[PDB]
């Protein structure tokens, strides 16, 4: 499928680049396509929570 | 109970400094090239 990778993130707003490369600007309240609902956003610690319990972090090759 | 006095003093200096820190805002800058 398509995996979204964190590119830019701060408190409030989070910009995620998918595996396809598409950029998506989202907030805490927003339904992530193909994953559910963004449960929690944390700029530090590289943690994003999905309604399905998925943990999402920054892209590995770009650290 | 006298700790409020030093608590009054130290917090006052920060807060009075702190408030205007968010207050002042700069303006734009337009650059033309030819």
């Amino acid at each position: 499928r398509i995996i979204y990778y964190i590119q830019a993130v701060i408190p409030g707003r989070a910009w995620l680049i998918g595996s396809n490369g598409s950029t998506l600007t989202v907030r805490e309240g927003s339904k992530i396509p193909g994953y559910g609902m963004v449960k929690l956003i944390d700029s530090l610690q590289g943690r994003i929570l999905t309604s399905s319990g998925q943990v999402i972090k920054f892209s590995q090759e770009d650290s | 109970q006298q700790e409020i006095q030093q608590r009054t003093s130290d917090m006052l200096t920060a807060a009075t400094q702190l408030v205007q820190d968010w207050k002042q805002v700069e303006t734009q800058v337009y650059t033309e090239g030819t």
């Binding site: 830019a8 598409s22 920054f58 770009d62 650290s63 | 700069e26 650059t31 090239g33 030819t34």
Partner: protein, 242 residues
């Protein structure tokens, strides 16, 4: 009689209150203190270079640029075809946090931030491009982008993939293969075998090939599991996977 020696020793103590060992130790302490002062918490961001095509759609997500305080970043802007696109004018907001260095005619700009965690916005207008381009910039991310190349949707003032294949840059969509018995580069991006080497291929035969000044060959061909390579006047055979 030992009065002179006592006077000399106390005078020496007054003149040099520090032993050479103490001097060396305190110099080392100072150097370590300097190291501690220069030490930066966390981890430094990774120096990176990026290239991306800006979508000028009304619903398109505005481009975002990573930054860091006290560092210089280069922003170069070419058209869709990659031709250089000289800049006409630009507009900056929140000038205190960001200082702009810009030559009059260059299509590339140098920018340094000043504060740590204050994001901003920037506007650009090109020579022929009527529609202004607006970008957002966020400082202090996990990585530092030294160079950012941006493609414009429209045709630039001027106007290849196989050349970049010859250079070493893979075309987008490439998937790795397995080559055994030979030191050649084989890539598959659009069901076309791109093969880069310095030798010559004999039996399969190419439909298009490119060469470099230094003497590197890169052929594009259809899928063939077996290859015949000629070098030093002798021809041998090798095989690939997929």
């Amino acid at each position: 009689e030992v009065i002179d020696k006592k006077a000399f020793k106390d005078m020496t103590r007054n003149l040099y209150p520090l032993n050479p060992e103490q001097v060396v130790k305190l110099k080392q302490i100072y150097e370590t203190s300097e190291y501690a002062k220069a030490a930066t918490p966390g981890t430094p961001p990774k120096p990176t270079a990026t290239s991306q095509f800006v979508n000028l759609s009304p619903g398109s997500t505005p481009p975002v640029i990573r930054l860091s305080q006290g560092f210089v970043s280069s922003l170069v802007f070419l058209d869709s075809t990659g031709a250089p696109w000289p800049i006409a004018a630009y507009d900056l907001g929140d000038p205190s946090s960001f200082n702009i260095q810009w030559d009059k005619t260059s299509n590339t700009l140098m920018i340094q931030a000043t504060k740590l965690y204050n994001y901003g916005n920037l506007a650009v207008r090109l020579r022929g491009l009527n529609t202004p381009v607006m970008l957002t910039l966020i400082p202090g991310q996990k990585a530092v982008d030294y160079r950012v190349d941006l493609r414009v949707q429209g045709y630039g003032p001027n106007a290849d993939l196989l050349l970049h294949v010859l250079e070493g840059v893979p075309p987008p969509g490439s998937r790795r293969l397995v080559v055994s018995g030979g030191d050649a580069r084989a890539w598959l991006s659009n069901e076309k075998m791109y093969v880069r080497t310095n030798l010559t291929i004999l039996s399969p035969g190419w439909l298009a090939s490119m060469t470099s000044a230094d003497g590197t060959h890169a052929y594009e061909m259809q899928k063939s599991p077996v290859l015949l390579v000629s070098w030093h006047g002798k021809v041998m055979q090798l095989k690939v996977e997929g």
